[PDB]
Amino acid sequence: GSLQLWQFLVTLLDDPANAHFIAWTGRGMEFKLIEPEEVARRWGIQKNRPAMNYDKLSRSLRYYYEKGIMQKVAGERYVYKFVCDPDALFSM
């Protein structure tokens, strides 16, 4: 029952109160960190680990890249995508 970064990001993305700093782009499961540092700060609050910033957050995203969970969309700057559909991981 420990909160995972991919789960936290999904929760941010499905709440329109967060749309000014993180939002689905509308292509597949791609999303943009409109304010990367605000996303990082909120992950830090949630997971209880200041001083979280985007530099540190990017290390966790690179972890997800190496582990097949997330990809960084090339040609973009702060656009990522889920590889495995988070809803499908628990649909059964």
CA distances from 69 to 3, 19, 50, 78, 86 (A): 15, 22, 24, 16, 10
Domain count, the chain: 1
The resolution, in Å, is: 1.8
Experimental method: X-ray
Q: Choose among 55, 25, 30: nearest CA to 40.
A: 55
**Domain extent at residue 42:** 1-92
Question: CATH code at 47?
Answer: 1.10.10.10
